[PDB]
Symmetry: C6
Subunit: 220 residues, 6 copies
């Protein structure tokens, strides 16, 4: 990663063993459950493209997911290059060349070029751009490896309301879109797919009930 | 988090893998027992709103609770906005715009704006305001997920007084309120719900007995 | 905690995850065995009142003990305030208000006021005063949760002398008082409650025998 | 390793017990699965040749592979020497002699000469040259210890498409080459070795299908 | 402990949770095997007397031994006092009073007086004097809790010579003395207590045989 | 150990708990397998003689090996003293006395004298000299505790060639000598003790076959 020293300079630091192991173990145990994204984002804090490639290369298995990840990265790399055509010319003494999509992904850039970009003034944050592409890719995988659709979450006749809302939002969290799309899913389904007893109770509460009020009203 | 380095400057640091892991593990093992609040408060020491969102996002399961958490956050954010009317105008070169509620919650603010607010002179401590909203929300979840009422905690005819006082205060701590009447639940409900043998001993102790005095008197 | 930076300034540091976990685990495994006090004292090195409250709030269970702890703290807080009546008046530019008992315990003080007190010149060590009150409270709990009295420690007819002295001083360590009180317990009981064979041997050694000499004399 | 301290100077540091342990454990559990290469590359960040030799020497077992590793290192060292002819002559007071192949490999160079090369201006990065030779050697070991060929990876008549793509790319990654024909193995061999049900679906998708599109189309 | 920071100043640091835990665990698993002494000496590197008392106080059980430890400490403290007669007189502004025995042991000295002594110019190293007394006491405990005498360590008729030498020196190390006669126990008692087959071989080796030569000669 | 601070000064640091435990555990689990030497060398990076004595004193068991270690050290100490006769005379204000063999081994030197030697300009590295003696001793123990001779490694009639080369070089690694001696062992035995099928294949390859080529030729 790139961290600040006490001189105020952004300097490269080695990825710690603890960071590597934490990422390997969290994929081992949680696969592509939705909480893998924040874990990956937090563990890759300050990462260079090299660090991000290190983390993704240490994943054992799920190689189909990892290949989808590369295809996502390549599309985002192609989009970056078409929005940032590089301008030919000698790079000046105090400068860095402009990065191409393959440079952000680390396939055509050295770690020293990545450090130069990330510690420049102003910085060109190839690590955070790459991370964006990867997390975009991981979001697709979480959505693809989600077993259940939001339309299939229906409260059982003896199922406690808390357990049902747990399943509802767990399912909703794995199909990532805008929250505009997730507010629409809730307003469309959460009360309508409650069991007949709780549904009649919540209809009387009206559309303005908070979730806390809905869960208290269907308590047992 | 934003911590002071070894020289006295407030710097951004990455959330550590141990901090991430410790918070995930505490929710896994303790759910919303009351001791999750101090663990969350201590593990989020110096957190930015991004750090707090990371921690909350790493929680697997309990998504009904996490949704209640967002609704509490949004209520407090709207209250913040109603108390901090917007002042339109170009932000001056040195300084930073006033934060809205969604900026404190981290949904419309970047990490660099959060660093800018938290390291300002004087600092606008968005991380601690956000943290205060979250703990307010987590306190509701603890209250709601507490199974038993204090009026149902009663000493068995053969149950040692110590175990009953353990159950009593464990319950009182989960059923959260101000000390206005929790102070009230002790000293009279604690005696009223003692078994007849210990209850008879505790009347003889008279008003003003310490809990140590009550526990010594009902040992045998 | 409050630690020294390399500038010579006492600065606040976040309580580490390792410190929190160590305290939670040691209470989980050792309850209120006497070695909980030094573990708590060492783990709370440099603690602010906030850190001490964090540690005690993370304890799961033993809530009867924790309430006795609060009653001890409140008595010590009441004693502090009666010995340190606060003097009204505007606090000067370079100063801190004088702390009340509730400020030392952290119920009416902010972490910033605790930092101001603890890093003042000279420091007013509210953290070490609070710790004193807490450890005073923990000593009462260790003494209350001790199963055996010193008068019941009697050497068995086939019990090795080392095992008996182990039990004797383990029991003596849980009833904390002055060592004047613990030297008196030893001189009164250790030889007199040895089994008849070892007792006759140790009577001949005389009152001036070291424990090492007594244990060699009753070896087997 | 040679890392930058908190002030900006390149200093030698001892390899940490966690780094040593992490590398030993990764070889123990993963042998020469492909993910051992990124683990070795990341754990050897900033390594001197002495550090790299230490890491390789801590490997227990797999001594046939480790001997192949030495033979690869020696071939690269001889290639280095043929490209860097020796210049005889007294080394000047300030500077350091040119490294031979055996010096990069650490067999004829001391740790202080390795520090001298790596902290020179400009640096001669013997640790990264050595690391590049080792990973070249470890890549051969992975290729050799890969049990299955990509031509033998075929989808079963009832095997889900996802599991087959997992096996396909896991295998392709172990059978190491350039993307010249690994790019080639995908998109046609991946389809050719699908079972007849999915194969029929994938012809209808036509050329240019993403892996996400192929995996969505053969879900059911 | 009192350690040097990154700038060259001697500063007080809190004993780490790992150091506390490591010492507790070592006593739990190894009791008073000889290797507890180096573990205690290394884990108490730079300790103040308060740190040493903390470590000793965290020991659960073995209270008979811990009481022997106090008696040894008190004997050494009295010897220290008899060699360092008190000089009455007001302590000058810059300097510190001379330490008594109880101050080195930490029973009549505060942590700040211990820091003052240890960081003085020249330093009065009360922590190392205290440590020396404790290890003297722990050495007595190891000697006393060693079950077997060196005269009872003898090679079985079918026991491999290596295992017997292992038992021999393991025992010799627990039965602690100076090398005046431990040097003596080897080379003649080691041969005398060998079984007749190996004993006959070792006479033929003659005086001056190394232990490697003896162990090679009694392999078969 | 002796580490560099940020002032450029070599300063003493306490041996970490993690370093102590790592060395104890690696001996516990791996005994004197050959990888114990690099683990010991890496874990004792920067060690003082005191640290090296600490590490070796913490080893439980294998006391016969540890005594052979002392005899090796004493021979190397005797050789050092006969090559470095100390010259009598007052030590100057800015100087350190010359170290004897017993000073390098730490039996007649204080930790402060070891720090003085190791941080002198130029340094006299008693820690690295001692380490050399110890590792010389550990090499003898690895060679003594090796069960199998190189002449007994013969490929089985159904044994895969990789497994046989594994055993061959594992055995060869435990009998440490020069690689001149280990190249001679390979050229003498590796092909000649292959099973009759693989032997005839490798004879045709000729003496110039790499190990990688030999292992591919005897694949199955
Ligand atoms: C960097 C990174 C780690 C990030 C970020 C990141 C950034 C912002 C926000 C956020 C913060 C505050 C509010 Cl008030 C809202 C909001 N209020 S609103 C308009 O009503 O929805 N929305 N947001 C998302 C925003 F801003 F993106 F829109 C937020 C989050 C929340 C943090 C959070 C998690 C939590 F558990 C509980 C909380 F109280 C807050 N995380 C999510 O909300 C994820 N989530 N998804 C869904 C579902 F799909 F089911 F609906 C559900 C959640 C849920 F909250 F967990 C809960 C069960 C419901 N995280 S990264 C690149 O890896 O992602
Ligand atoms: C979360 C966070 C931000 C915080 C804080 C925070 C802030 C202040 C205080 C506090 C400190 C000292 C006193 Cl004397 C009192 C007091 N004395 S009084 C006039 O009698 O009420 N009150 N308080 C709360 C105050 F100030 F809020 F009012 C306190 C606490 C205590 C700390 C504490 C915990 C403990 F175990 C034992 C202690 F001795 C002290 N924690 C609680 O008290 C929680 N608790 N709740 C109840 C119940 F509900 F059952 F009654 C019960 C407890 C209990 F003590 F554990 C015990 C069984 C009874 N914590 S953080 C930094 O931890 O992350
Ligand atoms: C900060 C903190 C961690 C502290 C402190 C703290 C401060 C000082 C001292 C101390 C130091 C040296 C001596 Cl010589 C005496 C002494 N010599 S004397 C006049 O003969 O008794 N007395 N003391 C206590 C003093 F000073 F307080 F009086 C001491 C201790 C000892 C440290 C110690 C522990 C140990 F195991 C073995 C040792 F050699 C020394 N710890 C105790 O002694 C606790 N203990 N209690 C009893 C019993 F009840 F059974 F008798 C028993 C012990 C015992 F020693 F373990 C042993 C079985 C007997 N600790 S804190 C706030 O959390 O407490
Ligand atoms: C060892 C080290 C020094 C390094 C490096 C290193 C350097 C660059 C790159 C890389 C980055 C981005 C893209 Cl877009 C491509 C690309 N896009 S492309 C035009 O389609 O080929 N190619 N590359 C390799 C490049 F640049 F070398 F060509 C890359 C990688 C990727 C990192 C990565 C891993 C991952 F899991 C998922 C990702 F999204 C990205 N790792 C690999 O690709 C390894 N891999 N191999 C194969 C196979 F053989 F099966 F095909 C397969 C993978 C796979 F991706 F895992 C997946 C199943 C398929 N690593 S380090 C720092 O880790 O220690
Ligand atoms: C506690 C502490 C403060 C200290 C120190 C401390 C100080 C010095 C020395 C030492 C160093 C080198 C030599 Cl050559 C000799 C020597 N050579 S000699 C002329 O033959 O006697 N003697 N010494 C002790 C000296 F100096 F004190 F005399 C030493 C030791 C050795 C270190 C060591 C341990 C080891 F395993 C193997 C080694 F090669 C060296 N440790 C011991 O020797 C302990 N030991 N005891 C006996 C027994 F009793 F059975 F005989 C046995 C050992 C044994 F070696 F393990 C082995 C089975 C035999 N430690 S600390 C820093 O660790 O925390
Ligand atoms: C500081 C310390 C930690 C050190 C060092 C240290 C110093 C240098 C070297 C070394 C480096 C590069 C080359 Cl190219 C050769 C070489 N090339 S050559 C002329 O053809 O043999 N030789 N060397 C040893 C040299 F220089 F000493 F001669 C080397 C090693 C290698 C490092 C290494 C280990 C490894 F696993 C795989 C590698 F590719 C490289 N370690 C060994 O080789 C140990 N080993 N022993 C034998 C056997 F006996 F079976 F043959 C076998 C090995 C083996 F390699 F593992 C493998 C199965 C064969 N380590 S310390 C004081 O604790 O030792
Ligand atoms: Cl780490
Ligand atoms: Cl890269
Ligand atoms: Cl894989
Ligand atoms: Cl989820
Ligand atoms: Cl509910
Ligand atoms: Cl960490
Ligand atoms: Cl955010
Ligand atoms: Cl009780
Ligand atoms: Cl930590
Ligand atoms: Cl507080
Ligand atoms: Cl509780
Ligand atoms: Cl005890
Ligand atoms: Cl005994
Ligand atoms: Cl470490
Ligand atoms: Cl080397
Ligand atoms: Cl799929
Ligand atoms: Cl720690
Ligand atoms: Cl003390
Ligand atoms: Cl042997
Ligand atoms: Cl450590
Ligand atoms: Cl020493
Ligand atoms: Cl031993
Ligand atoms: Cl081996
Ligand atoms: Cl093979």
């Amino acid at each position: 990663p790139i961290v600040q020293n006490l001189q105020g300079q952004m300097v490269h630091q080695c990825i710690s063993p603890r960071t590597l192991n934490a990422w390997v173990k969290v994929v081992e145990e949680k696969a592509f459950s939705p909480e893998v994204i924040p874990m990956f984002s937090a563990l890759s804090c300050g990462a260079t493209p090299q660090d991000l490639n290190t983390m993704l290369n240490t994943v054992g298995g799920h190689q189909a997911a990892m290949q989808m990840l590369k295809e996502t990265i390549n599309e985002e790399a192609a989009e970056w290059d078409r929005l940032h055509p590089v301008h030919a010319g000698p790079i000046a003494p105090g400068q860095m060349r402009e990065p191409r999509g393959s440079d952000i992904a680390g396939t055509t850039s050295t770690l020293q070029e990545q450090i130069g970009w990330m510690t420049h003034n102003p910085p060109i944050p190839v690590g955070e751009i790459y991370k964006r592409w990867i997390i975009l890719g991981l979001n697709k995988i979480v959505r693809m490896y989600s077993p259940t659709s939001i339309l299939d979450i229906r409260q059982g006749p003896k199922e406690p309301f808390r357990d049902y809302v747990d399943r509802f939002y767990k399912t909703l969290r794995a199909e990532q879109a805008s929250q505009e799309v997730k507010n629409a899913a809730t307003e469309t389904l959460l009360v309508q797919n409650a069991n007949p007893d709780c549904k009649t109770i919540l209809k009387a509460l009206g559309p303005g009930a908070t979730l806390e009020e809905m869960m208290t009203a269907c308590q047992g």
